[PDB]
C-alpha cells in the first residue's frame, strides 16, 4: 500500500503514464480536468496512484490531496524548455508545505523523443534539485509511450517505502 | 527430545493399540515439530523414533526428506541413521528417493570404507532402476578396488544393478575377469553369486565362464580338503555357504555341456561321498549336490547314487528332509524318471503325512508321477486322496487331477468317468477356468455323448448348487440334447428322459439364487438351442424366454430379448444358425 | 534370493521387517499380517518351511520370537535356515546371550548387523568373525 | 494397599530391569496427608507382600529400594525412609518397627561380543522383637 | 541462518556456484541428479544452501524443499537463449505457489563468457521480471568460474534477510 500522487504541468503524459502503469497501453486520453486513480500493483506494494491533471484551474486544488501522501511523482516534460521555469516555480511552491513533508520525490523526464528532450541531468539543474531539503528526490528519465524507465522508477520507489 | 528406548519403554507400556496410537501421535507431532525447526541435533533420534513407528506401521511419509538430510549430513552416526531409513521409508515407487543419487555418488567417493559400505548397502538393497543406471560406472569402479570390505559389497551391488537393469551386465563382463583367486571367502562368495547372476541372465556369457569351471573345481575341492578353519566352520563343515553357490554355479553350468560337466564330475563324486550327513549343514550340502547332478549331463554313476542318496532322504524322520526329499524328486521328474517311480509308495505315504507342505509336495509330485502306466491305479488313490484332501487341497487336487488325466488317459470313456466323478465330488472347489477345458475335451470327445449327457443329467438332478458342475451341464444339454431326449417328440413309454423336467431343471436354475448367472447365461443358451435340438415341446420354452426379457441382469436382459424376436419373428431363422459349434484345440 | 525377512514375537509383534523386494506399504501391511497368522497357526512338526505363493517360505522358531524368510523357488532351504542361524549366531556374536528385550530396544543395530550380513537378499560375508568385526569398527568409529 | 496393586508388576519390572549389582527438586502431592510407614500398616504391608507375591527370595538391592520407596510416597503418601536396614556387618535387619522382612545375603544383549546382593526373609517377630535394636542399641535409646 | 534454494535449469553452474561460495574453487562436478547442501557462512549469516540439480526427472520434486524457504536463487544461463522460454515457464510455474510465498528471489546471470551471454537487463525482460507480484526479486549477473558478482549477490541477500 502506498499513496501516490502524479503532479506536474498539463500535457505531461501523466495519464499516459498512469494507464501504462496500470493497464499497459497508451490509451487516447483527453486533457484530464479532474483526477485519476488506479491501484498499480507491483513489487509487493499496491501503489494507489492519484493522478491529477495539471491545468491552470486545478493547481490550487492540489493541496487537498497532500494528506497521508507517502510519495510524489512530479512529472516534467523534457520537451518544454519554456515551461521548466514555472515547473520549477511549481515545485518550490508545492514542496514547501507542512502537509506533504515526509513524502519522497521521483521526477519523470517524460517524452524522451526529440533532441528537444533533455536528459535527467540538465532537467535536474534547470530545476535545481540539489537545492532541496528533507528530500529523497530522485529524477528518473522515462518514456511513457514505450514503458521505458517507468517500472524502474517504481522499482526505486518501492525501495523507498520501508525504512 | 527423548531417546528411542525411552519412547519404546513408553510404547511397551501401551495396552490398547488405539491407546498406543495416542502415544504415537503424541511423539509423532514432536517429531514433526522438530522437523519444522530444521534440527540437526536430535534429527538422529527423531528419525530413529520415527522408523520405529514405521516398523510399528505408522504414516511416516513426512520425515523422508530429513533422511536425505541425514544422508547428506557429515556426522557418521547421522549417516548411519540416514542410510537405514532410506532403505526403509523409500522404495522405487516412493518417487522422492531420486535425491539420494547425488548423495550416494559423493559417498561412493567418501574416504571411509564404512561410509562407502553404507552407500553400497543402501544401493544394493533398494537401488532404483534409474539409480542403478546412474551409479553403474561407480560400482564397477568400487569393484575394481582392492578393498575386500568393498569388493564383497560392490559385487552384490553389481548383481542388484544387473538384477534391476538386465541390459547393464556387459560392462561387468570386464569387471569380473580373473578375481576368482580371492583369498577371502566372502568376496569370493559374492563373486560366485555374481557369476551365478552373470551366467543366469545371458547365455552369451556362458562361453567365457565355463572356461573357469576347472578353476573353481579346484577351489571347491580346496573347500572339501580344507576340512577346518576357525571361521566359516559350522559343525565341522567348512564354508558351506560358498560350497552350495559353487554347486549352483556348477548346476547352471554344464547343464547342456559335457566337458565342463566332466570337468566338475570328480568333485561331484567326491562330495557325494565326502560329506557329513549328520548335521543339517551336510544335508544342505548334499541336497544341492543332488540337484547339481540332476540338471547337468552328469555321470550315470552319480545319478544312480543320487537316487540312493534320496532314498535315504525319503526315510529320514526329519520333516525338513522329507520336504527336502519331496522337493528333490519334484525337481528331477523327467530326468531319471523311473528311479523316481520306484519310490512311489513313499509318495503315497506322504499323502497321509500330517504336514501341509509335505502333503503339498506329495500331491503335486503325484501329479508329476503319473505316466501312462500308473494312470489307472494311482488316480484311485488320488480320487480317494481328493476325498481326503483339505479344502485348500481340494481346489488344488481337482485341477491337478484334470491336468494329468488330459495327458495319459488310456480311455476316453474312463477319462470321462473320472472327470464326472471329480465334478460330483469337487463342486465348489474345482476352478471355473477348467470348465471351458472340460467342455473342449468332451467335444474333443466325439463318440460318447449319449453316454455323457445322461450321466450329466443323472447328477444335476441331485444338485445344482455345485456351480462348476452345472456350468458343464447346460452346454451339453444345449448341444447334445438330441442324444438326451431321442425320438420323443410326443409321449412314449416312460424312459428317464422326459423332455419337460429336462426343461424344468434348467428353469430351476434360472429362478434359484444359487446361480452364477453364467449358469443362467448357459441356461438360456441351452433353452434357445433346444428350440432346435428338441422338436418335442418348443414354444413353451418361448414363454420362458419371453418372461425373462424384463430380467435384472443386464446381459441376461439382453439375452432374452435378443432370443425372443427369433422366437416371435424369425422362427425359421432360429434353426438357421443353431448348427453345432466347431471343435478346436 | 531372500525376498524379505520378518521377526515377529510370540504375540506376533514384528520386531523386524526387511523388504528386499519393492512392494507398497498396504501390501506390506497385508502380507506381513497374513504370514504371521500363517506361522502362528502352524505346529511344531510342520517341516520349518511353507510353500507360500511361489515363495518357499522359511520359518524357524528359536525363542518366543519367530523368524521368516521368502526364498526364491530354485535355491537351498536348510542353508536358508542356516542363514537364519548364522544370523542368529551373529546376533549371538555381537550381543552374547542374545535376548528378547534389546531386540525391542537395540533393533537399530540388528538392522546394521543384517546390513553387515545380508544386502540385496544375499550373503556378503560367509565368515562370522569378519562381519561383526566391521560393525565394531564402525561402532569404534561412532 | 489398594493402589499398590496396579504397580505391583509394573514397578517391580522397573526394579527387575534395574541392575541389582532434566530433573531437579522434590515435588509434594497437594492436599494429601503424609505419615511414615506405621506399625499396623507395615503389618498391613508385610502381609501385602506375603500375599501378593513376587518379592520373597528376590535379589534385593538399593536401586530397587529407591525405585520402590519413592513410588510408595507418590502413590500412597508415606515417607520413603522406612525401607532402611542395618549396614554391612551382620544380617541386614530393618530399623523399621513393623517390617517383618530381614535381608540375608544370597534383556541380555547389553553383554558385549567376546568379553575382552541381598534377599528377603520373612521374620514376623521383627515387628515385636526389634533385632535391629539389638544390633543398634545406642541409636534407639 | 537462512535456507537457500538453488533452482534452475541444468548445466547452469549451480553446483559450480555452490562450491565456489563454499569452497572457493571450481571443482569438476558431475551433472547432479540429487542435491547438494553446503552452509555458506558470509556477511556473518550462515546461508544453508540447498543446491538442487535441474534435469527433467527432478523438477517435480522441487516442491518438497519449498517449506520454510526464506530465499531463492534462480540461476539462468546467459548462454541459453533457447532455454530462456522454459526458464520463464519454470519461474512462473514455481513462483505461483502458496508454499514458498515469503522468500526473496536472486536471479544469477551465470556463464558470462561470450557475446552470446547476455547482461542482467535482457535476461530481466526475457523472463519478464516486471510482471512479478509480492516479490523482492533482483537479478545479479554472476560469473561462477571467477567468483565475480557471486558474493555481491550474497551481499544483497543478507540485506534482505532482515526487514
Ligand atoms: N512522443 C511521446 N509523447 C508522449 C509521451 N508521453 C506523453 N506523450 C504525449 O503527451 C500527451 C499528454 O499525455 P496525456 O496523458 O494524454 O495527458 P496528460 O499529460 O495526462 O495531461 P492531462 O490529461 O491534462 O492530465 C499525449 O497525448 C502524448 O501524445 C512520450 O513518452 N513520448
Ligand atoms: N565459461 C563459463 N562456464 C561456466 C560458468 N559457470 C558454469 N559453467 C559451466 O557450466 C557447467 C555446469 O556447471 P555444474 O555446476 O558443474 O553443473 P550444474 O549447473 O550444477 O548442473 P547439475 O549438476 O545438473 O545441477 C560447468 O561444467 C561449467 O563448465 C561460468 O561462469 N563461465
Ligand atoms: Mg491526463
Ligand atoms: Mg550440479
JSON list of C-alpha atoms in Angstrom, two decimals, chain A residues 23-159:
[
{"chain": "A", "resi": 23, "resn": "UNK", "atom": "CA", "xyz": [-3.07, -1.30, -17.87]},
{"chain": "A", "resi": 24, "resn": "UNK", "atom": "CA", "xyz": [-0.03, -1.23, -20.09]},
{"chain": "A", "resi": 25, "resn": "UNK", "atom": "CA", "xyz": [-1.33, 0.57, -23.16]},
{"chain": "A", "resi": 26, "resn": "UNK", "atom": "CA", "xyz": [-1.27, 4.12, -24.46]},
{"chain": "A", "resi": 27, "resn": "UNK", "atom": "CA", "xyz": [-4.95, 4.97, -24.47]},
{"chain": "A", "resi": 28, "resn": "UNK", "atom": "CA", "xyz": [-6.11, 8.13, -26.21]},
{"chain": "A", "resi": 29, "resn": "UNK", "atom": "CA", "xyz": [-6.62, 10.39, -23.22]},
{"chain": "A", "resi": 30, "resn": "UNK", "atom": "CA", "xyz": [-8.40, 13.74, -23.07]},
{"chain": "A", "resi": 31, "resn": "UNK", "atom": "CA", "xyz": [-6.83, 16.62, -21.11]},
{"chain": "A", "resi": 32, "resn": "UNK", "atom": "CA", "xyz": [-7.97, 15.41, -17.73]},
{"chain": "A", "resi": 33, "resn": "UNK", "atom": "CA", "xyz": [-9.65, 18.15, -15.73]},
{"chain": "A", "resi": 34, "resn": "UNK", "atom": "CA", "xyz": [-10.33, 16.16, -12.61]},
{"chain": "A", "resi": 35, "resn": "UNK", "atom": "CA", "xyz": [-8.11, 13.40, -11.39]},
{"chain": "A", "resi": 36, "resn": "UNK", "atom": "CA", "xyz": [-7.38, 9.73, -11.87]},
{"chain": "A", "resi": 37, "resn": "UNK", "atom": "CA", "xyz": [-6.71, 6.79, -9.63]},
{"chain": "A", "resi": 38, "resn": "UNK", "atom": "CA", "xyz": [-5.58, 3.27, -10.45]},
{"chain": "A", "resi": 39, "resn": "UNK", "atom": "CA", "xyz": [-4.03, 0.93, -7.91]},
{"chain": "A", "resi": 40, "resn": "UNK", "atom": "CA", "xyz": [-0.87, -0.14, -9.68]},
{"chain": "A", "resi": 41, "resn": "UNK", "atom": "CA", "xyz": [0.10, -3.46, -8.12]},
{"chain": "A", "resi": 42, "resn": "UNK", "atom": "CA", "xyz": [3.82, -4.04, -8.36]},
{"chain": "A", "resi": 43, "resn": "UNK", "atom": "CA", "xyz": [6.75, -5.20, -6.21]},
{"chain": "A", "resi": 44, "resn": "UNK", "atom": "CA", "xyz": [4.87, -6.34, -3.05]},
{"chain": "A", "resi": 45, "resn": "UNK", "atom": "CA", "xyz": [3.28, -2.87, -2.69]},
{"chain": "A", "resi": 46, "resn": "UNK", "atom": "CA", "xyz": [-0.04, -1.77, -4.14]},
{"chain": "A", "resi": 47, "resn": "UNK", "atom": "CA", "xyz": [0.66, 1.73, -5.39]},
{"chain": "A", "resi": 48, "resn": "UNK", "atom": "CA", "xyz": [-2.52, 3.76, -5.03]},
{"chain": "A", "resi": 49, "resn": "UNK", "atom": "CA", "xyz": [-1.81, 6.47, -7.55]},
{"chain": "A", "resi": 50, "resn": "UNK", "atom": "CA", "xyz": [-3.73, 9.74, -7.52]},
{"chain": "A", "resi": 51, "resn": "UNK", "atom": "CA", "xyz": [-3.06, 11.08, -10.97]},
{"chain": "A", "resi": 52, "resn": "UNK", "atom": "CA", "xyz": [-4.43, 14.62, -11.19]},
{"chain": "A", "resi": 53, "resn": "UNK", "atom": "CA", "xyz": [-4.47, 16.80, -14.30]},
{"chain": "A", "resi": 54, "resn": "UNK", "atom": "CA", "xyz": [-2.17, 19.79, -14.43]},
{"chain": "A", "resi": 55, "resn": "UNK", "atom": "CA", "xyz": [-4.13, 22.64, -15.98]},
{"chain": "A", "resi": 56, "resn": "UNK", "atom": "CA", "xyz": [-4.43, 26.13, -14.53]},
{"chain": "A", "resi": 57, "resn": "UNK", "atom": "CA", "xyz": [-7.79, 25.89, -12.76]},
{"chain": "A", "resi": 58, "resn": "UNK", "atom": "CA", "xyz": [-6.75, 22.72, -10.90]},
{"chain": "A", "resi": 59, "resn": "UNK", "atom": "CA", "xyz": [-3.37, 23.66, -9.36]},
{"chain": "A", "resi": 60, "resn": "UNK", "atom": "CA", "xyz": [-4.88, 25.43, -6.31]},
{"chain": "A", "resi": 61, "resn": "UNK", "atom": "CA", "xyz": [-6.94, 22.34, -5.57]},
{"chain": "A", "resi": 62, "resn": "UNK", "atom": "CA", "xyz": [-3.75, 20.28, -5.46]},
{"chain": "A", "resi": 63, "resn": "UNK", "atom": "CA", "xyz": [-3.44, 20.92, -1.71]},
{"chain": "A", "resi": 64, "resn": "UNK", "atom": "CA", "xyz": [-6.43, 18.72, -1.00]},
{"chain": "A", "resi": 65, "resn": "UNK", "atom": "CA", "xyz": [-4.63, 15.52, -1.87]},
{"chain": "A", "resi": 66, "resn": "UNK", "atom": "CA", "xyz": [-1.45, 16.31, 0.04]},
{"chain": "A", "resi": 67, "resn": "UNK", "atom": "CA", "xyz": [-2.59, 14.41, 3.15]},
{"chain": "A", "resi": 68, "resn": "UNK", "atom": "CA", "xyz": [-1.35, 10.90, 4.02]},
{"chain": "A", "resi": 69, "resn": "UNK", "atom": "CA", "xyz": [0.70, 11.09, 0.82]},
{"chain": "A", "resi": 70, "resn": "UNK", "atom": "CA", "xyz": [3.59, 8.69, 1.02]},
{"chain": "A", "resi": 71, "resn": "UNK", "atom": "CA", "xyz": [5.13, 9.78, -2.28]},
{"chain": "A", "resi": 72, "resn": "UNK", "atom": "CA", "xyz": [5.13, 12.22, -5.17]},
{"chain": "A", "resi": 73, "resn": "UNK", "atom": "CA", "xyz": [5.56, 11.92, -8.86]},
{"chain": "A", "resi": 74, "resn": "UNK", "atom": "CA", "xyz": [6.32, 15.32, -10.27]},
{"chain": "A", "resi": 75, "resn": "UNK", "atom": "CA", "xyz": [6.20, 14.62, -13.98]},
{"chain": "A", "resi": 76, "resn": "UNK", "atom": "CA", "xyz": [8.15, 17.04, -16.10]},
{"chain": "A", "resi": 77, "resn": "UNK", "atom": "CA", "xyz": [8.26, 17.28, -19.86]},
{"chain": "A", "resi": 78, "resn": "UNK", "atom": "CA", "xyz": [11.65, 17.02, -21.44]},
{"chain": "A", "resi": 79, "resn": "UNK", "atom": "CA", "xyz": [10.23, 18.86, -24.45]},
{"chain": "A", "resi": 80, "resn": "UNK", "atom": "CA", "xyz": [9.17, 22.01, -22.55]},
{"chain": "A", "resi": 81, "resn": "UNK", "atom": "CA", "xyz": [12.14, 24.28, -22.12]},
{"chain": "A", "resi": 82, "resn": "UNK", "atom": "CA", "xyz": [9.72, 27.21, -21.88]},
{"chain": "A", "resi": 83, "resn": "UNK", "atom": "CA", "xyz": [7.73, 25.68, -19.02]},
{"chain": "A", "resi": 84, "resn": "UNK", "atom": "CA", "xyz": [10.60, 24.39, -16.88]},
{"chain": "A", "resi": 85, "resn": "UNK", "atom": "CA", "xyz": [10.64, 27.71, -15.01]},
{"chain": "A", "resi": 86, "resn": "UNK", "atom": "CA", "xyz": [7.03, 27.66, -13.86]},
{"chain": "A", "resi": 87, "resn": "UNK", "atom": "CA", "xyz": [7.52, 23.95, -13.17]},
{"chain": "A", "resi": 88, "resn": "UNK", "atom": "CA", "xyz": [10.47, 24.92, -11.01]},
{"chain": "A", "resi": 89, "resn": "UNK", "atom": "CA", "xyz": [8.25, 27.59, -9.55]},
{"chain": "A", "resi": 90, "resn": "UNK", "atom": "CA", "xyz": [5.55, 24.95, -9.06]},
{"chain": "A", "resi": 91, "resn": "UNK", "atom": "CA", "xyz": [7.96, 22.59, -7.35]},
{"chain": "A", "resi": 92, "resn": "UNK", "atom": "CA", "xyz": [9.28, 25.24, -4.98]},
{"chain": "A", "resi": 93, "resn": "UNK", "atom": "CA", "xyz": [5.71, 26.39, -4.49]},
{"chain": "A", "resi": 94, "resn": "UNK", "atom": "CA", "xyz": [4.41, 22.94, -3.64]},
{"chain": "A", "resi": 95, "resn": "UNK", "atom": "CA", "xyz": [7.16, 21.19, -1.68]},
{"chain": "A", "resi": 96, "resn": "UNK", "atom": "CA", "xyz": [7.38, 23.97, 0.92]},
{"chain": "A", "resi": 97, "resn": "UNK", "atom": "CA", "xyz": [4.32, 22.83, 2.86]},
{"chain": "A", "resi": 98, "resn": "UNK", "atom": "CA", "xyz": [3.97, 21.26, 6.29]},
{"chain": "A", "resi": 99, "resn": "UNK", "atom": "CA", "xyz": [1.40, 18.91, 4.92]},
{"chain": "A", "resi": 100, "resn": "UNK", "atom": "CA", "xyz": [3.40, 16.79, 2.46]},
{"chain": "A", "resi": 101, "resn": "UNK", "atom": "CA", "xyz": [6.69, 16.97, 4.31]},
{"chain": "A", "resi": 102, "resn": "UNK", "atom": "CA", "xyz": [7.66, 13.27, 4.57]},
{"chain": "A", "resi": 103, "resn": "UNK", "atom": "CA", "xyz": [6.90, 12.13, 1.01]},
{"chain": "A", "resi": 104, "resn": "UNK", "atom": "CA", "xyz": [9.88, 11.36, -1.21]},
{"chain": "A", "resi": 105, "resn": "UNK", "atom": "CA", "xyz": [10.28, 12.63, -4.75]},
{"chain": "A", "resi": 106, "resn": "UNK", "atom": "CA", "xyz": [10.59, 10.76, -8.07]},
{"chain": "A", "resi": 107, "resn": "UNK", "atom": "CA", "xyz": [10.82, 13.03, -11.11]},
{"chain": "A", "resi": 108, "resn": "UNK", "atom": "CA", "xyz": [10.00, 11.75, -14.60]},
{"chain": "A", "resi": 109, "resn": "UNK", "atom": "CA", "xyz": [11.76, 13.21, -17.63]},
{"chain": "A", "resi": 110, "resn": "UNK", "atom": "CA", "xyz": [8.88, 12.16, -19.83]},
{"chain": "A", "resi": 111, "resn": "UNK", "atom": "CA", "xyz": [8.66, 12.39, -23.62]},
{"chain": "A", "resi": 112, "resn": "UNK", "atom": "CA", "xyz": [12.19, 11.35, -24.46]},
{"chain": "A", "resi": 113, "resn": "UNK", "atom": "CA", "xyz": [11.54, 11.51, -28.18]},
{"chain": "A", "resi": 114, "resn": "UNK", "atom": "CA", "xyz": [13.42, 14.53, -29.56]},
{"chain": "A", "resi": 115, "resn": "UNK", "atom": "CA", "xyz": [16.77, 16.29, -29.40]},
{"chain": "A", "resi": 116, "resn": "UNK", "atom": "CA", "xyz": [14.50, 18.90, -27.80]},
{"chain": "A", "resi": 117, "resn": "UNK", "atom": "CA", "xyz": [14.08, 16.36, -25.00]},
{"chain": "A", "resi": 118, "resn": "UNK", "atom": "CA", "xyz": [16.76, 16.74, -22.37]},
{"chain": "A", "resi": 119, "resn": "UNK", "atom": "CA", "xyz": [18.38, 14.14, -20.18]},
{"chain": "A", "resi": 120, "resn": "UNK", "atom": "CA", "xyz": [17.83, 13.92, -16.44]},
{"chain": "A", "resi": 121, "resn": "UNK", "atom": "CA", "xyz": [20.95, 15.97, -15.66]},
{"chain": "A", "resi": 122, "resn": "UNK", "atom": "CA", "xyz": [20.07, 19.24, -17.40]},
{"chain": "A", "resi": 123, "resn": "UNK", "atom": "CA", "xyz": [16.48, 18.95, -16.20]},
{"chain": "A", "resi": 124, "resn": "UNK", "atom": "CA", "xyz": [17.81, 18.36, -12.65]},
{"chain": "A", "resi": 125, "resn": "UNK", "atom": "CA", "xyz": [19.85, 21.52, -12.73]},
{"chain": "A", "resi": 126, "resn": "UNK", "atom": "CA", "xyz": [17.27, 23.59, -14.53]},
{"chain": "A", "resi": 127, "resn": "UNK", "atom": "CA", "xyz": [15.03, 22.61, -11.65]},
{"chain": "A", "resi": 128, "resn": "UNK", "atom": "CA", "xyz": [17.82, 22.86, -9.10]},
{"chain": "A", "resi": 129, "resn": "UNK", "atom": "CA", "xyz": [17.14, 19.56, -7.39]},
{"chain": "A", "resi": 130, "resn": "UNK", "atom": "CA", "xyz": [20.30, 20.00, -5.32]},
{"chain": "A", "resi": 131, "resn": "UNK", "atom": "CA", "xyz": [18.60, 22.92, -3.56]},
{"chain": "A", "resi": 132, "resn": "UNK", "atom": "CA", "xyz": [16.11, 20.56, -1.94]},
{"chain": "A", "resi": 133, "resn": "UNK", "atom": "CA", "xyz": [15.76, 19.95, 1.76]},
{"chain": "A", "resi": 134, "resn": "UNK", "atom": "CA", "xyz": [14.49, 16.87, 3.63]},
{"chain": "A", "resi": 135, "resn": "UNK", "atom": "CA", "xyz": [14.20, 15.10, 0.29]},
{"chain": "A", "resi": 136, "resn": "UNK", "atom": "CA", "xyz": [14.82, 11.70, -1.13]},
{"chain": "A", "resi": 137, "resn": "UNK", "atom": "CA", "xyz": [14.40, 13.25, -4.50]},
{"chain": "A", "resi": 138, "resn": "UNK", "atom": "CA", "xyz": [15.38, 11.12, -7.46]},
{"chain": "A", "resi": 139, "resn": "UNK", "atom": "CA", "xyz": [14.87, 12.09, -11.08]},
{"chain": "A", "resi": 140, "resn": "UNK", "atom": "CA", "xyz": [14.06, 9.18, -13.39]},
{"chain": "A", "resi": 141, "resn": "UNK", "atom": "CA", "xyz": [14.10, 9.73, -17.16]},
{"chain": "A", "resi": 142, "resn": "UNK", "atom": "CA", "xyz": [11.10, 7.90, -18.60]},
{"chain": "A", "resi": 143, "resn": "UNK", "atom": "CA", "xyz": [9.47, 7.21, -21.96]},
{"chain": "A", "resi": 144, "resn": "UNK", "atom": "CA", "xyz": [5.73, 6.96, -21.46]},
{"chain": "A", "resi": 145, "resn": "UNK", "atom": "CA", "xyz": [4.81, 5.83, -24.97]},
{"chain": "A", "resi": 146, "resn": "UNK", "atom": "CA", "xyz": [7.21, 2.88, -24.64]},
{"chain": "A", "resi": 147, "resn": "UNK", "atom": "CA", "xyz": [7.14, 1.98, -20.93]},
{"chain": "A", "resi": 148, "resn": "UNK", "atom": "CA", "xyz": [10.84, 2.74, -20.61]},
{"chain": "A", "resi": 149, "resn": "UNK", "atom": "CA", "xyz": [12.10, 3.61, -17.14]},
{"chain": "A", "resi": 150, "resn": "UNK", "atom": "CA", "xyz": [8.58, 3.55, -15.73]},
{"chain": "A", "resi": 151, "resn": "UNK", "atom": "CA", "xyz": [8.84, 0.31, -13.78]},
{"chain": "A", "resi": 152, "resn": "UNK", "atom": "CA", "xyz": [12.37, 1.32, -12.81]},
{"chain": "A", "resi": 153, "resn": "UNK", "atom": "CA", "xyz": [11.09, 4.43, -11.09]},
{"chain": "A", "resi": 154, "resn": "UNK", "atom": "CA", "xyz": [8.51, 2.22, -9.37]},
{"chain": "A", "resi": 155, "resn": "UNK", "atom": "CA", "xyz": [11.41, -0.04, -8.51]},
{"chain": "A", "resi": 156, "resn": "UNK", "atom": "CA", "xyz": [13.27, 2.81, -6.79]},
{"chain": "A", "resi": 157, "resn": "UNK", "atom": "CA", "xyz": [10.04, 3.99, -5.22]},
{"chain": "A", "resi": 158, "resn": "UNK", "atom": "CA", "xyz": [9.20, 0.60, -3.72]},
{"chain": "A", "resi": 159, "resn": "UNK", "atom": "CA", "xyz": [12.62, 0.62, -2.08]}
]
